[PDB]
């Protein structure tokens, strides 16, 4: 499971960015 809300943002996106995705 699940990195689309873990380091998803920590890479080079915001906490909302992944939101629209995952």
UniProtKB/Swiss-Prot annotation:
Q: Give Gene Ontology CC terms.
A: extracellular region
Name of the protein this chain belongs to: Potassium channel toxin kappa-KTx 1.2
* Description of post-translational modifications: The two disulfide isomers globular (C1-C3, C2-C4) and beads (C1-C2, C3-C4) do not show activity on Kv10.1/KCNH1/EAG1.
Any idea which UniProt keywords this protein has? Answer: Amidation, Antimicrobial, Disulfide bond, Fungicide, Ion channel impairing toxin, Neurotoxin, Potassium channel impairing toxin, Secreted, Toxin, Voltage-gated potassium channel impairing toxin
The Gene Ontology terms for molecular function here are:
potassium channel regulator activity; toxin activity
A Pfam family (short name) is Toxin_25
Annotated site residue numbers, Basic residue of the functional dyad:
19
| PTM sites of type Cysteine amide | 22
Q: In which tissues is it expressed?
A: Expressed by the venom gland.
GO BP annotations, alphabetical order: defense response to fungus; killing of cells of another organism
Write out the domain note.
Has the structural arrangement of two alpha-helices stabilized by disulfide bonds (CSalpha/alpha 2(S-S)).
Per the UniProt record, the lineage of the source organism begins with: Eukaryota, Metazoa, Ecdysozoa, Arthropoda, Chelicerata
Native species: Chersonesometrus fulvipes
- Disulphide bonds annotated for this chain are 4-22, 8-18
> Annotated site (Aromatic residue of the functional dyad), which positions?
5
